[PDB]
């Protein structure tokens, strides 16, 4: 009765959703990039090799020095590492080692991870007295921790297993905002650059953006086939890019509400891992199944480079605040910097 | 140029310190075995924990060898994206209830998901121990044959147990051939693919508190010893 | 977006048979296996069938074999299920599902609860 009604007119609203989309699409990215040069071919090498981590690392993150960074790895340990020099300066033991996202807060006095334990925990790096020590533990999500990213020293976003993404308050430690809407597990999550927005993406092959402030969704995207593992902002914060497991990347664009362009090729038959732009935005870094990385034009579609210096699955990648290096965390242990 | 000479030697100083605490923490991680317990509904993998938040964790000790076992909490039950995190353990342990052939159909889930973990690919090195759970409900269902093998499983009609088999004292030959069908349902997953790197340990338990530990001792001293003669081309 | 839409199924007196089909858009349909799968008044869903990328390699659960047949056709993106000798214990939604991944032969999460790539379902009843 009123379910097959409400079904007509759910089918109607994505029909006039695609009629609408139909027609702002004049043109496309190839067409207008048509004449533009190529970049040509990109070379890039590994200058530093960080060994200490004993099992698989999943996650890392640079801090906004562009020198500093952390590292996750499912031995148990949280690993501060100086990337010049190569010395480590932390090494954290968590209470449980199943971990699978960190993050490193822009001011550089906080790191943050969680996982298996469905609970986010912060550790102060500015203790007057003692080495590090956890300063709060989240909780309240009721599956595993995915991702997780500082707006201040006073707040943070997670996305979990349990199908939502929470805004935090770390003194009081509550949740302020839940964003539902998504029906499979969100995988990753990425701030605009003026933390007024942010995007996820789920194991429904959909992307969402979310108004910090309002805690609503604003626009969905689709368009993959398979679940989405990684996203990240243009640097302009008017378009975005998705990673999938049906071993594809795309651009989608926030204006024009639509997807820009793919990148495949027909010898690629793996997931991507990881993806990040790097600072003008004209390249486009893919991590792979396939043990390494894919270095595209973000404006032509064409592979530039690759990254072939890992033994096992590529986890994570990174690019520097300064647009200088690039890193690279695999399964077998080691972190690569490459430039 | 002195000050940063002393911020040198001082940071020097911290990565050394780093490096022996994780050279300690490397020997303690090297020497105890992890292993993931799975099961269902009503396996009975909680008599398994018995005899013995997101994901628990018991910890035991067999001949001064150390194992730490977990086992997942308040996890949603779609498993494609977390099972992924335990590719390292030295076993995964699959607890079956044996007795709920007749969702009213468990065995074939069970037979489902474990086709699924076995042919993973980011599981084709790790190997399982299969607990089939529950024998006195089997065997009190298979004597008061109210409800038959067959018509769930129709190959049950040419089935003739094994001449290797082994029953326990007091068994009715039909329950001995129920309990080795049931074994051979898992065993024609596991045998068809793997290129010996990685092996099924099928046992049958009813209500033992250290006959399940000292198994699951025995089956660790046999993967490890498979991987090593693997090795070396011995196997 | 990812799309199944089941069709067929109804009122069937016991004994008589049915085909059940389910089109597919919005991915490369040749790249996934399928399956057929079912839930039943007051139970949870249960797996019945399915089939491979070039549909050599077909499964079947215990209680359907030799009543039940399932085929696909690449061409029209189509899957079919034939029901034949049907008994009042196959009155059930009946839902088709796809594989989570491409290029794979594990199928892990296609009987939970809420799963994504799943349609709607078709009823199928068997009474006299």
């Known amino acids: 009765s009123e379910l097959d009604q409400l079904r007509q007119e759910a089918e109607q609203l994505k029909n006039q959703i695609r009629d609408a989309r139909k027609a702002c699409a004049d043109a496309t990215l190839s067409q207008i990039t048509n004449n533009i040069d190529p970049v040509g071919r990109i070379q890039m090498r590994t200058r530093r090799t960080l060994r200490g981590h004993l099992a698989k690392i999943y996650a890392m993150h640079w801090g906004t020095d562009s020198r500093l960074l952390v590292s996750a790895s499912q031995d148990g340990k949280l690993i501060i590492w100086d990337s010049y020099t190569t010395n480590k300066v932390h090494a954290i033991p968590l209470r449980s080692s199943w971990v699978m996202t960190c993050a490193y807060a822009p001011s550089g006095n906080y790191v943050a991870c969680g996982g298996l334990d469905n609970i986010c925990s912060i550790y102060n790096l500015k203790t007057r007295e003692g080495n590090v020590r956890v300063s709060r533990e989240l909780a309240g999500h009721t599956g595993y921790l995915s991702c997780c990213r500082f707006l201040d020293d006073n707040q943070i976003v997670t996305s979990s297993g349990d199908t939502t993404c929470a805004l935090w308050d770390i003194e009081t430690g509550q949740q302020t905002t839940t964003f539902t809407g998504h029906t499979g597990d969100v995988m990753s999550l990425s701030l605009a650059p003026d933390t007024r927005l942010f995007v996820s993406g789920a194991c429904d092959a959909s992307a969402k953006l979310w108004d910090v402030r309002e805690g609503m969704c604003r626009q969905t995207f689709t368009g993959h086939e398979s679940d989405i593992n990684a996203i990240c902002f243009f640097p302009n914060g008017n378009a975005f890019a998705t990673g999938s497991d049906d071993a594809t990347c795309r651009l989608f664009d926030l204006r024009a509400d639509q997807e820009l362009m793919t990148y495949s090729h027909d010898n690629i038959i793996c997931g991507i891992t990881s993806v990040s732009f790097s600072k003008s935005g004209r390249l486009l870094l893919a991590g792979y199944d396939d043990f390494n990385c894919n270095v595209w034009d973000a404006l032509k579609a064409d592979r530039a480079g690759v990254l072939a210096g890992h033994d096992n699955r590529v986890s994570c990648l990174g690019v520097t605040d300064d647009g200088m290096a690039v890193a690279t965390g695999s399964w077998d242990s080691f972190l690569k910097i490459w430039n | 140029t002195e000050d940063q000479r002393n911020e040198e030697k001082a940071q020097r100083e911290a990565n050394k310190k780093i490096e022996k605490q994780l050279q300690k923490d490397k020997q303690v991680y090297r020497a105890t075995h992890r292993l993931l317990l799975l099961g269902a509904g009503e396996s009975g993998k909680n008599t398994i924990v018995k005899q013995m938040s997101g994901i628990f964790e018991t910890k035991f000790q067999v001949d001064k060898v150390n194992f730490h076992m977990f086992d997942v909490g308040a996890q949603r039950d779609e498993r494609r994206k977390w099972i992924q995190c335990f590719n390292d353990v030295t076993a995964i342990i699959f607890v079956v209830a044996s007795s709920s052939y007749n969702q009213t159909n468990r065995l074939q889930a069970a037979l489902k998901l474990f086709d699924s973990i076995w042919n993973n690919k980011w599981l084709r090195d790790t190997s399982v121990i299969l607990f089939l759970n529950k024998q006195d409900l089997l065997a009190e269902k298979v004597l008061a044959g109210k409800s038959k093998i067959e018509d769930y499983f129709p190959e049950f009609a040419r089935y003739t147990t094994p001449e290797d088999a082994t029953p326990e004292p007091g068994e009715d030959p039909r329950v001995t051939r129920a309990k080795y069908f049931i074994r051979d349902e898992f065993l024609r997953i596991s045998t068809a693919s793997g290129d010996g790197r990685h092996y099924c340990y099928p046992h049958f338990t009813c209500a033992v508190d250290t006959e399940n530990i000292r198994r699951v001792f025995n089956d660790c001293r046999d993967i490890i010893q498979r991987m090593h003669l693997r090795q070396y081309e011995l196997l | 977006q990812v799309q199944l839409q089941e069709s067929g199924g109804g009122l069937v007196q016991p004994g008589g048979s049915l085909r059940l089909s389910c089109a597919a858009s919005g991915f490369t349909f040749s790249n996934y296996k399928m399956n057929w799968v079912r839930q039943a008044p007051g139970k949870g869903l249960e797996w019945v069938s399915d089939?491979?990328?070039?549909?050599?390699?077909?499964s079947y659960t215990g209680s359907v074999k030799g009543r039940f047949t399932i085929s696909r056709d690449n061409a029209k993106n189509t899957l079919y299920l034939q029901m034949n000798s049907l008994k009042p214990e196959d009155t059930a939604v009946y839902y088709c599902a796809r594989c989570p991944a491409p290029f794979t032969r594990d199928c892990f999460d296609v009987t939970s609860t809420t799963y994504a790539y799943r349609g709607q379902g078709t009823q199928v009843t068997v009474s006299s």
């Open positions: 089939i491979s990328q070039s549909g050599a390699s077909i």
